[PDB]
Write an enzyme that holds these catalytic residues in place. Structure first.
Site, short mmCIF file in Angstrom:
data_model
loop_
_atom_site.label_atom_id
_atom_site.label_comp_id
_atom_site.label_asym_id
_atom_site.label_seq_id
_atom_site.Cartn_x
_atom_site.Cartn_y
_atom_site.Cartn_z
CB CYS A 139 45.55 34.05 20.41
SG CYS A 139 44.48 34.69 19.10
CD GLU A 173 46.71 40.50 15.00
OE1 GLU A 173 46.85 39.29 15.30
OE2 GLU A 173 46.47 40.89 13.83
#
Ligand SMILES: [Zn+2]
Lengths: 272, 42
Positions: A139, A173
């Protein structure tokens, strides 16, 4: 629902729900220490904490220092509470973020503005130490009052500077915030255009991958959005022209990040 | 709003003064949710 927090010198409106535990999640306002990130439900707790807490920077190691910005590397196993608190803070502004307590498998890179008073958090990214798909960012977030200043693209560039030293490619991701999505597109495009400008586009996709640590898939994806790659019936070939590259680097849409990572200012190596 | 924002607020330290800010407190409070997260992943 936590509607807003006070952290450092800002009261910031929360964008999204964050699972602050127990009754803390029910408060309309929380107060966070800007240095150790501990949350509190009562203003007086915060004000007392102001004079007690002796932290004036993130824990962990300062691995980057250039002018008034520093990056601190924080291993989730060494400073678990800090990292859990960071994730809860992040979640207030991150829609799609899903773990926040199992922090041991993560390292966190905390971007800070440094003044005489201390090192002030402005954003971060988390990185899964052992990614089975080799994700180099899980993140990423710039806190709202610091947005639109290039900090997101700096952190993204930073994540690739780490991947370069690890001599591997890496990719964020899924999922990423929509703002993250745009910062990646913009950062990738600039980086590739910089190279295709200086190498007259005489390199393969693999070459580009090695020079930037951007995966081949992400390079291809970016080149497609730039209309600078074609599938020769077996493989992807770079199709670049002076006109394409110049008129892209012109449109303000594609601009150099205002803040870039200086390798010489990075004191770091991967574990071993 | 539909457009969250921020503002400058100053608060003064409180020198001579309900929540315990000890690390201990946080690890206890967070212990279970960690396990919960580890399990859901498993
Ligand atoms: Zn503190």
């Amino acid at each position: 629902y936590v509607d807003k927090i006070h952290i450092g010198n800002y009261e910031i409106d929360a964008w999204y729900f964050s699972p602050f535990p127990e009754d803390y999640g029910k408060q309309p306002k929380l107060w966070l220490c800007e240095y150790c990130l501990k949350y509190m439900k009562y203003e007086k707790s915060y004000r007392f904490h102001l004079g007690q807490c002796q932290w004036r920077q993130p824990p962990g190691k300062e691995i980057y220092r250039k002018s008034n910005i520093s990056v601190y590397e924080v291993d989730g196993k060494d400073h678990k509470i800090y990292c859990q608190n960071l994730c809860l803070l992040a979640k207030l502004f991150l829609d799609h973020k899903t773990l926040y307590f199992d922090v041991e498998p993560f390292v966190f890179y905390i971007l800070t503005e440094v003044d005489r008073q201390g090192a002030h958090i402005v954003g971060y990214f988390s990185k899964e130490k052992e990614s089975p798909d080799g994700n180099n960012v899980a993140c990423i977030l710039t806190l709202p009052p610091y947005q639109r200043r290039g900090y997101g693209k700096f952190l993204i560039a930073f994540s690739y500077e780490l991947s370069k030293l690890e001599s591997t490619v890496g990719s964020p991701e899924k999922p990423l915030s929509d703002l993250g999505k745009l910062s990646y597109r913009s950062y990738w495009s600039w980086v590739l255009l910089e190279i295709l400008r200086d190498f007259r586009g005489t390199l393969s996709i693999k070459d580009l991958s090695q020079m930037t640590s951007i995966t081949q898939n992400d390079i291809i994806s970016t080149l497609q959005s730039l209309n600078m790659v074609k599938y020769w019936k077996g493989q992807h070939v770079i199709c670049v022209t002076p006109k394409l590259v110049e008129e892209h680097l012109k449109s303000a849409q594609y601009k150099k990040p205002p803040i870039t990572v200086d390798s010489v200012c990075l004191k770091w190596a991967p574990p071993k | 709003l539909a457009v969250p924002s921020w503002r400058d607020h100053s608060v003064e330290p409180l020198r001579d003064p309900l929540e315990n800010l000890d690390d201990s407190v946080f690890s206890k409070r967070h212990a279970k949710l960690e396990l919960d997260e580890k399990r859901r992943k498993r």
